[PDB]
């Protein structure tokens, strides 16, 4: 099959800027059938450029694609907030059409340290026999951050899972969510909880903890 | 205007097979091709196959050749996809999308119109509602609802049912290794409301008709 791969994967600009996307095929694309999409989430794509450089219908003249043969690049001339979404590209010159692993554009601001909450799990949950420990990290940027889990200063690995939100669309940060699994009967014997958080904005890392009972 | 509409949410077991339909209306059917792509969560699209109703021409991705079929009612200007073979590989959300028109009448090609969009899960667990916990806060303070173990996707969450939207942040759901899912919804208010006002989330599992409005207190 044709392999069509994407550049950047995910980058960050600001509104007014040029955008400018890449994706290579494993071979010619023949005839410049190469189409690009937007997606934003929950969405269905939303076709862009199609034939190289055609433009859908309903799609502002600030998009415009460009390319031959292998290297094809989709070019956003001056960003607007409505255009912080996926991209993707496609080829339909052979029966075999395939699509690019898609290029996230992020919107760019300034350093932001995440604000870092801690909570136990409820007396309610302790009933079923299972505790969550659950970290919160709130309003921060770049999305880069790390999580630590400490249970009595031992690091735990592999029994935590965390997600991370969509960028705000007014303040361009991410929060994080991080809930450590562990059973009640391991819970209950011991007593320091900690999150431990490293992130661009902050000098040195950040603990919140508590003591079980307290 | 061309509109492409989808059947609804689909959870299957592996091994077993899933159809899924799309009615076109507001354009010409038979003559322009439709085609299934589907995306798994956080994933890139995968074009599975499509169909040119006219002829009843097929093309399928080779990957899925051999589990995909692909068919067309022109009485009802619906197109169906069939998936056998199901294994948990094959959660995603699975689109129809239609080629453009051109000048002329002429076929398009690339995907012009999309249909929303059809959630299936593959999966051995059985349809779960959630259980939710509180999450307790202690000049801003954040609190929140651990919203666990539900099965399948998706949960919605509301905070004081719809009141409070500043500051709200509910978290994509983890699926963890039970087969369950799990999420988070937080939000941030001010520490001196903590004494008077409440707080309450609305928590919507609609693939198991469960709803459950969860005060959560200091």
């Known amino acids: 099959e044709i392999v069509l791969t994407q550049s950047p994967g995910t980058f960050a600009l600001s509104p007014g800027e040029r955008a400018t996307l890449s994706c290579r095929a494993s071979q010619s694309v023949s005839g410049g059938a190469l189409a690009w999409y937007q997606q934003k989430a929950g969405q269905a794509p939303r076709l862009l450029i199609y034939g190289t450089s055609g433009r859908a219908t309903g799609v502002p003249g600030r998009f415009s694609g460009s390319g031959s043969e292998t290297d094809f690049s989709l070019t956003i001339s001056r960003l607007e907030p409505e255009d912080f979404a996926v991209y993707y590209c496609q080829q339909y010159g052979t029966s075999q059409s395939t699509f690019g692993q898609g290029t996230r554009l992020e919107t760019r601001r300034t350093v932001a340290a995440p604000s870092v909450f801690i909570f136990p799990p409820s007396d309610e949950q302790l009933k079923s026999g299972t505790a969550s420990v659950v970290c919160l990290l709130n309003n921060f940027y770049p999305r880069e951050a790390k999580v630590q889990w400490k249970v009595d200063n031992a690091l735990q690995s592999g029994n935590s899972q965390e997600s991370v939100t969509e960028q705000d669309s007014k303040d361009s940060t991410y929060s994080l969510s991080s809930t450590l699994t562990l059973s009640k009967a391991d819970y209950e014997k011991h007593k320091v909880y900690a999150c431990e958080v490293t992130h661009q904005g902050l000098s040195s890392p950040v603990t919140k903890s508590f003591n079980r009972g307290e | 205007k061309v509109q492409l509409v989808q059947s609804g949410a689909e959870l299957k077991k592996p091994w077993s097979s899933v159809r899924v339909s799309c009615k076109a209306s507001?354009?010409?059917?038979?003559?322009?091709?439709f085609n299934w792509v589907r995306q798994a969560p956080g994933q890139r699209l995968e074009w599975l196959g499509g169909?040119?109703?006219?002829?009843?021409?097929?093309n399928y991705a080779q990957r899925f050749r051999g589990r995909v079929t692909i068919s067309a009612d022109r009485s009802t200007s619906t197109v169906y996809l069939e998936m056998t073979g199901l294994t948990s590989a094959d959660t995603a959300v699975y689109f129809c999308?239609?080629?453009?028109?051109?000048?002329?009448?002429?076929?398009?090609?690339?995907?012009?119109?999309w249909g929303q969009g059809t959630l299936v899960t593959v999966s051995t667990a059985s349809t779960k509602g959630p259980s939710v916990f509180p999450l307790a806060p202690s000049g801003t303070a954040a609190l929140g609802c651990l919203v666990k173990d539900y099965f399948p996707e998706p949960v919605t969450v509301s905070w004081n049912s719809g009141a409070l939207t500043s500051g709200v942040h509910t978290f994509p759901a983890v699926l963890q290794s039970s087969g369950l899912y799990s999420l988070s919804s937080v939000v941030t208010v001010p520490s001196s409301s903590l004494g008077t006002q409440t707080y309450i989330c609305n928590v919507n599992h609609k693939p198991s008709n469960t709803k459950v409005d969860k005060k959560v207190e200091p």
């Open positions: 999308a239609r080629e453009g028109e051109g000048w002329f009448g002429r076929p398009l090609r690339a995907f012009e119109f």
């Open positions: 507001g354009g010409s059917f038979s003559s322009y091709a």
């Open positions: 169909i040119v109703p006219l002829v009843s021409s097929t």
